[PDB]
C-alpha cells in the first residue's frame with residue numbers, strides 16, 4: 001500500500017489514486033512575488049479556547065492529535081472561509097534532516113517540518129461527508145524551523161515514546177493547540193487537496209507566513225517514531241512529506257501586503 005518509500009511513495013500514488021494528477025493538488029510552492037494581496041480577505045478567526053483534545057495516534061504515516069469535534073468547541077472562521085470549520089485533528093510532516101520536511105515551500109525554500117490543523121465545514125455534518133465537497137475542509141498550515149524550542153510543543157514530544165509504532169495510541173487530554181501558533185496570522189490561501197491518499201480535492205489551504213521555531217531536540221524526537229508496526233523491521237518515520245505539485249489554474253492570494 002501507499003507510503004513514502006521508493007516503491008510506494010508520492011510518484012506511485014497516481015496508480016491507486018488517479019486524482020494525484022488532478023487540477024487542484026497540494027502541496028504547492030508559494031511564489032511570494034506572484035501571490036496577490038487580496039484586500040477583501042478578512043482576518044482569520046482561530047477560536048481554540050474550548051478545544052478538547054482526546055488522543056494521540058501513530059497511524060503509520062504521521063501522528064495525529066485528535067479532538068472532540070461533536071460540538072463547536074475549537075473552530076476556524078473568517079479569512080477566505082464561508083461558515084464555520086471544526087478542528088478534528090492536527091499532525092505534522094517532517095524530514096530526515098533540517099533542510100527538508102515541509103510540504104508547502106516558499107520561493108522553493110523547504111522548512112524542517114509543517115503542522116496541519118485540520119478542520120471540517122459544519123454545514124456537511126461530519127468529516128466523512130465534508131471530504132466529498134470542494135469546500136469541505138480548511139487546513140491551517142504552519143511551518144517549523146529549527147532554532148529555539150517551542151514550549152507548547154513539548155507535551156507532544158514527550159508522549160511520542162508511547163506511540164512509537166503504527167497503530168499505537170495514547171490518551172492525550174487537555175492539550176492546548178494555541179501553544180503551537182505564531183504571533184502573526186498573516187497567511188496565503190489557495191484551493192487544494194489532502195496531501196496523502198485519497199488526495200481528495202476538498203481543502204481550502206490557509207498557510208501562515210510566520211513559522212514557529214522548534215528546537216533540534218524536539219524535531220529529533222519526531223524522527224525516532226516508526227512507520228512500521230511493533231515487531232516489524234524498524235523504518236524511521238522521516239520524510240513523510242509530499243513534494244510540491246503543479247499549480248495549474250490556481251492563484252495564491254495573500255492576506256497581507
Ligand SMILES: CN1C(=O)NS(=O)(=O)c2ccccc21
Pocket residue numbers: 116118137139193194195196
Ligand atoms: C493525512 N492528511 C495529511 O497528511 N495532510 S492534510 O492534507 O492536512 C489532511 C487533511 C485531512 C485529512 C487528512 C490529511
Ligand SMILES: [Zn+2]
Pocket residue numbers: 091092093116195
Ligand atoms: Zn498533513
